[model samples]
Target chain A: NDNITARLDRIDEKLSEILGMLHTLVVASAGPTSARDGIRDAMVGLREEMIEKIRTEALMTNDRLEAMARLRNEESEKMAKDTSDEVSLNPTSEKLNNLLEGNDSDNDLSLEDF
Target chain B: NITARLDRIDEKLSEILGMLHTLVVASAGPTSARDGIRDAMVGLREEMIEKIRTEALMTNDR
Candidate 1:
């Protein structure tokens, strides 16, 4: 029982951390001058909604283990590969890599020319 | 009990999907990179939602 709650807590923490990173990325990428300014507003709304849901939901620890067990049973076969791959490279980190790599590769001019 | 858990699952799913949408919209990078991220999110979201819905039904049967 306690262990289940602990695991849930950790999951929640990791999810919050991931969402925080996404918020930062959205702001940076969809700023005022960008074409996706509306996307920034949508993200802000989603962030607020998620935060509210996290705060208001009263998920009892008792059911946590059972829910997890059932979830695992259902997901085991389909998600095996995805779970492994995502653990290695989640969407946030992958997108960050894309953005940073774009920045690095976009500038064709060499420093030697400066 | 199951309802609350399902609610939580639904909210989390929505949050993840919403974040994925944000990524798809805000990514200013190569088309391949953007599509890769989008496809990954779509796959994950579809899998998790299916699992959660199944779990919910299983719980209700108990």
Candidate 2:
């Protein structure tokens, strides 16, 4: 994952280089003409666009990871509900009660033990 | 899956990086510098849109 993170650093570096290039271009074309202004505006727009895209991607990535987490939680809750439903349906069964006993505590059971 | 997405994004970014170089070169050449940069911007926008739309669909499916 270091390599993956390194890519982000590289992106930042590239972005900086592009911005620097934009500054150089702006200075080289310095004038009161609309053409120069238009070009400057376009480059500025490009910079903003790049930043926006990066931010959007970051938020999207966060949303995706959160979605996966929610899915996992939903799965866990469904399994728990199913287990409780089984216990309730067979309340008097010794095996069910045996399984339910001590189940009130956290870490009382694990999937491997089951 | 996230890693794959990141890799794809990195590829896109790399393409943009290449275009930036082209843009700078065009700015100093007989070619239409503004058009070159404009085309690059369009390309970047299209690429970005693709990623954004893909992500939106993925979230919707989830």
Candidate 3:
């Protein structure tokens, strides 16, 4: 301890290094106490950032999902086309076709309770 | 004949709607539809929350 202070005494005698040492030591411990709030704020910010990122990502996932649904619906609709074209297909298509062809009010047969 | 046609159209309408429903559900995976999106998003939020905490806790200012 005497030797350490003897050498420190020479520097302090020459330049009063105590102020510089105090500054260095003060900042040396800045990590735990000083930065605690910064860490807390960072954590909260990242949480909200991730929440926002998930919002964007989830939308794209759902968008592709619906697009895929419609596209696959189109694919299956056409996949059965060979045999279907030769023999005709689902009643929805036929009804729609009938509607296109005549827009007929012919179903005016009106509901009779059978 | 018109009654039969109207009934057939109703039947086809059911099939079309049901088919679309099943396809979207299948695309969402076996856990179930729409709800899985919500479930997984909550799951990811949990993951990222933990990640951010763990990262900040372990970080050093070097």
Candidate 4:
């Protein structure tokens, strides 16, 4: 019990940290290359790290989550919007990248909606 | 039963989900930074959504 609780907390904090880092770096003047490599690395790195920890895990059975599929739907739409912006992607990121597309490749993380 | 616990977990998922959206918006660097945070965010969403969702079942099965 404590373990999952702890894992959940860690998940929250790590995302906070990643968000903070990206926010700061983008707002800063780091190498432009950092944008490309850094962002890709961060995306894949973050995805894999969580995948290992989160491994395989949805619980919309909770009844209060119709909103998620709605918003998550927004995410998929935006996923296309942004990913298409990158025509020069490498395979690793691309797999995961395309993995995120349309939530079909969602096992790219995991999904079927509620 | 973890009905209440499930709600808590669901709430946490929502928070995490919000942070992810915020990150995606903040890292909107067209391709690069968005890739960094966007993919990670989406990956986490799928996994984490299932995470709290599935974790609930696993925990309750005990």
What local distance difference test score does each model get? 0.54, 0.52, 0.44, 0.49
Write one digit per residue (lDDT tens) for candidate 3, span A1-114.
577557644644544343333222210011122334431111112233334433565212334434443433354444466547476658998877776676567555546744
For model 4, the superposed segments whose C-alpha errors exceed 4 Å read A1-114, B30-62
Tens-digit lDDT string for candidate 3 (B3-47): 664565466556556654543433443223323463452234678
Q: Write the per-residue lDDT of candidate 4 for residues A1-114, one digit (tens) a residue.
A: 788677767766765665555433212212334234542221323333333322332111232233333333344444465678556667798887776778563573345653
lDDT of 1 by residue, A24-76 (tens): 43122222324433223223334334334334542223444444444334554
B45: Cα error in model 1, Å: 20
Off by over 4 Å in 3: A1-114, B30-62
Could you tell me the TM-score of chain B in model 2? Answer: 0.43
Error of 3 at B62 (Å): 52
TM-score of chain B of each: 0.43, 0.43, 0.42, 0.45
Please give the ranking of all candidate structures by lDDT, highest first, separated by commas.
1, 2, 4, 3
> lDDT score, residue A77, model 1?
38
Each model's total of backbone clashes: 0, 0, 0, 9
DockQ head-to-head 2 vs 3, winner: 2
Q: Tell me the docking grade of candidate 2.
A: incorrect
Candidate 2 overall lDDT versus native: 0.52
RMSD of each: 26.1, 22.8, 32.8, 26.0
Clashing pairs in 3: none
TM-score of chain A of each: 0.24, 0.23, 0.17, 0.23
- Candidate 4 accuracy as TM-score: 0.23
Pairs that collide, model 1: none
Flag the better candidate by DockQ, 1 or 3. Answer: 1
